[PDB]
Design a protein around this ligand. Structure first.
Ligand code: D5M
Ligand code: NA
Ligand code: NA
Length: 326
DNA sequence: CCGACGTCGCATCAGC
DNA sequence: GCTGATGCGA
DNA sequence: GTCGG
């Protein structure tokens, strides 16, 4: 209502720049421009007013002038009508098809899901699974579902080994009523840096979840990370729950809790905590915490074993995930 | 002017 | 066959 | 595209 019309404009140009022009840097720029505006409690009456905000320059200021004066963006309308560009942006929506594949497909005449089904012998394992759950992937995951899903993973991860620590991070940790992705992090005492690579640990857990029919498909799998699809048990009378995305990541006990807080969020929280860490003399790198020197030479990573453990370094108190928004 | 805007493990591909 | 670049996803 | 050395 306020600046929703402008934000929608910037977000469209953002996706265009990512999928069509393949300019991730201009994509992030347009995305950042829409962010600061979405936090502005006032109706932007002119581009000059918007340029004041960090992330908005002259180009975006001029665009707003046209959007308010004419009622839309002239350059944006040409993009929408352009069959070639509008189709490329669509194909990328499919998990597996990126900005490169989408273009290669359109050149061959493949532009829709219907056209994809015909030429399925041209899609790899990932691209096929994506097409299969095209809609199920674009749907949001309610907290209640996340809770039910969590119990299963926790029950199965402990049922296979009591020394397994698994915590679902992300928006879920912050108490979000939604999620859209099930990011799980796990560790074991038998895995601590110096310890040799463990292709048995992650594989062990994955097999157990597939054993109870939770994990349906697999996008990619290795010795440390896992990416696939999952689904809750079919309910009586009612229709079965949609297929959801799930990522499992094995992390050492030395980088576990340090890696937990990072994936716990938020995106703004990481920035504020990264800057404050440097103010005291420490530097965060997702994995460990290093005490830099007078010239900035990071030293030997100091021991970490908990969530508050890291706060007991930068003179900060334990801030609850429900408040780690900013 | 003009270069920096995170990352990185896994699957597919190129070249040798 | 092995090595190394490129594409993809959060 | 937007910022800052
Ligand atoms: N450019 C860049 N650098 C570093 N981290 C980034 C960047 N862009 C996004 N993110 C992080 C911020 C969130 O923790 C996560 C997305 O959360 P999700 O719930 O998966 O949408 O990705
Ligand atoms: Na600005
Ligand atoms: Na895609």
């Amino acid at each position: 209502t306020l600046n929703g019309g402008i934000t929608d404009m910037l977000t469209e140009l953002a996706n265009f720049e990512k999928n069509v022009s393949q300019a991730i840097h201009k994509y992030n720029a347009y995305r950042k421009a829409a962010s600061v505006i979405a936090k502005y409690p006032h109706k932007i009456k002119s581009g000059a007013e918007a340029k004041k905000l960090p992330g908005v320059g002259t180009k975006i200021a001029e665009k707003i002038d046209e959007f308010l004066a004419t009622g839309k963006l002239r350059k944006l309308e040409k993009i929408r009508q352009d069959d070639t560009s509008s189709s490329i942006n669509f194909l990328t929506r499919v998990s597996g098809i990126g900005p490169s594949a989408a273009r290669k497909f359109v050149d061959e005449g493949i532009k829709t899901l219907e056209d994809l089904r015909k030429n399925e012998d041209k899609l790899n394992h990932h691209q096929r699974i994506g097409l299969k759950y095209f809609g199920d992937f674009e749907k949001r995951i309610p907290r209640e579902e996340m809770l039910q899903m969590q119990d299963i993973v926790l029950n199965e991860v402990k049922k296979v080994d009591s020394e397994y620590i698994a915590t679902v991070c992300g928006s879920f940790r912050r108490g979000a009523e939604s999620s859209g992705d099930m990011d799980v992090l796990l560790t074991h005492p038998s895995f601590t840096s110096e310890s040799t690579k463990q292709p048995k640990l992650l594989h062990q857990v994955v097999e157990q979840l597939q054993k109870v029919h939770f994990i349906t498909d697999t996008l990619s799998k290795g010795e440390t990370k896992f990416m696939g699809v999952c689904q809750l048990p079919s309910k009586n009378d009612e229709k079965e729950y949609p297929h959801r995305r799930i990522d499992i990541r094995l992390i050492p006990k030395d980088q576990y809790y340090c890696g937990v807080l990072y994936f716990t969020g938020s995106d703004i929280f990481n920035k504020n905590m990264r800057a404050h860490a440097l103010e005291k003399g420490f530097t965060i790198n997702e994995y460990t915490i290093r005490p830099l020197g007078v010239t900035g030479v990071a030293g030997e990573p100091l021991p970490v074993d908990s969530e508050k453990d890291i706060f007991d370094y930068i003179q900060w108190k334990y801030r609850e995930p429900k408040d780690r928004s900013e």
